[PDB]
Design an enzyme around this catalytic site. Sequence first.
Site, PDB file in Angstrom:
ATOM      1  CB  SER A 243      -1.014   0.013   1.247  1.00 17.94           C
ATOM      2  OG  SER A 243      -2.055  -0.820   1.020  1.00 17.94           O
ATOM      3  CE1 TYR A 246      -0.660   0.870  -6.699  1.00 14.09           C
ATOM      4  CE2 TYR A 246      -0.677  -0.413  -4.742  1.00 14.09           C
ATOM      5  CZ  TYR A 246      -0.470  -0.371  -6.121  1.00 14.09           C
ATOM      6  OH  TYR A 246      -0.526  -1.375  -6.924  1.00 14.09           O
ATOM      7  CD  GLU A 327      -3.339  -6.491  -6.167  1.00  8.01           C
ATOM      8  OE1 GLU A 327      -4.466  -6.257  -6.785  1.00  8.01           O
ATOM      9  OE2 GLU A 327      -2.295  -6.208  -6.627  1.00  8.01           O
TER      10      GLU A 327
END
Length: 350
Positions: A243, A246, A327
């Site tokens: 994460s 991102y 995911e």
Amino acid sequence: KSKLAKPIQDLIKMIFDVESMKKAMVEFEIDLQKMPLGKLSKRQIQSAYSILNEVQQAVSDGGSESQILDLSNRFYTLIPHDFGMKKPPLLSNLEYIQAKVQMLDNLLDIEVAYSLLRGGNEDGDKDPIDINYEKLRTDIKVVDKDSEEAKIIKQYVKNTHAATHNAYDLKVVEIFRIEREGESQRYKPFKQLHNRQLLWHGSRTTNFAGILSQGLRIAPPEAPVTGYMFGKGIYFADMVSKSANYCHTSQADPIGLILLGEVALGNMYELKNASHITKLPKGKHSVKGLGKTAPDPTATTTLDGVEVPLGNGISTGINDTCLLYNEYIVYDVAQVNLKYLLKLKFNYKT
Ligand SMILES: Cc1cccc2c1CCNC2=O
């Protein structure tokens, strides 16, 4: 002056920083001279998604080159780009089209941020920070650094930092307990589901005013289902590492924001490869892309009834998988309840 704690003040200033919004746009190669922050409109973005959807279809199905040229021209006229001294690339490559679909996902949140910023700011009996905080309709509180809640979360950050992402370290600067207005209520029905986990969600700081006011959301009807690996849902991870990437931080801009949300997974539809999912199989509540590495299932804890996969990154048995990490995708905006927002400091190895 501001009645808010200092960390919350610094957080508001950061999510509403106009300069960061422009940097984001320049990075997507938008022409800021022809397309200023104030020109962005939701309608404009909707139409752009549609154009991308159509061009995506023409490339896949072998549509006329004249068609692809016309669609590219219309897109660049709707959203002015600055490619410097180079010729503008046509939207004829599925990867470039994917990049553009992502730019629009970001512009949707930037547009929300700027709109709020220029909203009702006339009140002189409130500090500007206080006024903008209220515009988020999200109760934000500082989590006590030495409490158990904070200890568990720091364990989750430290233990789940993947091996291949160790091009930087992560320091938790601040942890905020957040509660968006009306979110607990739309999420109530899902407390009846099993397999509820505390997962990660990273995004650019420029997206946060939109995320806090509107909550996390699935891409609109116009967006091509192809622009996303497992379809148009909401993505999460169990490794802080996946994460964090991102957040789009750098050595020049090292502070990133990251979310921890409670997500009602229920029975997961496990996949090892991409699948532009539209319908979910009967009896399934979410999708789970299987990775080669995941937190040690042995160390999993609970925090208010929610599973926290804080175990150290261990290799799973699966090999025929394209993914390195898991995911998690939910296709219903009501299947998630945001809990914490962490202020992270990315320390890059130099
Ligand atoms: C694609 C994907 C997988 C897992 C987590 C994230 C993403 C992109 C959106 N934000 C995330 O943290």
